[PDB]
Amino acid sequence: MIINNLKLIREKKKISQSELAALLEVSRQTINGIEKNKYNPSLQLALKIAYYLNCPLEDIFQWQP
Amino acid sequence: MIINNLKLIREKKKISQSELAALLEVSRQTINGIEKNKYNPSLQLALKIAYYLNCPLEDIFQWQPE
Ligand SMILES: *SCC1=CC(C)(C)N(O)C1(C)C
Ligand SMILES: *SCC1=CC(C)(C)N(O)C1(C)C
Known part of the structure; x- marks a missing residue:
């Protein structure tokens, strides 16, 4: 129920x-896993991802009821 | 570190x-723990909070770059 781009x-x-991955200090596998919707990052990792892609977080991870 | 508002x-x-708490379907204790900086809300909960408060999520939760 979280879409990601x-x-x-x-x-x-x-x-x-x-x-x-190097900017984030995580495994490349963890970035790949997120991209392929296998699991979601913690909030802090999500915020770091938004920071290093220079996009608002909600452009990258979307939730809706 | 995340600072929250x-x-x-x-x-x-x-x-x-x-x-x-009612709106987000979590407990009041959960909301209070976030506000007292005890408790780390999941990405999903943070997205729900930003959705209903109708503010960009980064107005509410700010990572301190490090
Ligand atoms: S940072 C926002 C952004 C950049 C680009 C990759 C061009 N996009 O498609 C969006 C709008 C997500
Ligand atoms: S939605 C952004 C916003 C609303 C209000 C609660 C009035 N604010 O102070 C900010 C700027 C966080």
Whole structure:
């Protein structure tokens, strides 16, 4: 019930997974897992992802009732 | 570290803790713990809070860059 646009946005910005993972200090596998909807990040990791992609968080992770 | 403004925004909007809790389907203790900086709201809960408070999530929850 959270939609995410992480892969689309990352790719539009021409950032690789390995590049984003290093900024975030997480495994590339964890970025990939999020992109593929296998699990969601904690709030802090989500905020760091938004910070390093320079997009509002709700552009990347969307919830709606 | 995340700094949050939930108390301030909630009270400016005249929403009580139990009111917010009901709307979000969580306990009042959960809302209070976020506001007393005990408790870490999940990404989903944070998104629900931003949705109903109708503020950008980063107005409510701010990561301190590090
Ligand atoms: S930062 C917002 C943003 C950038 C871009 C990748 C061009 N987008 O499609 C959105 C609007 C998400
Ligand atoms: S929605 C943004 C917002 C509303 C109000 C509660 C009046 N605020 O102080 C901010 C700017 C957080």
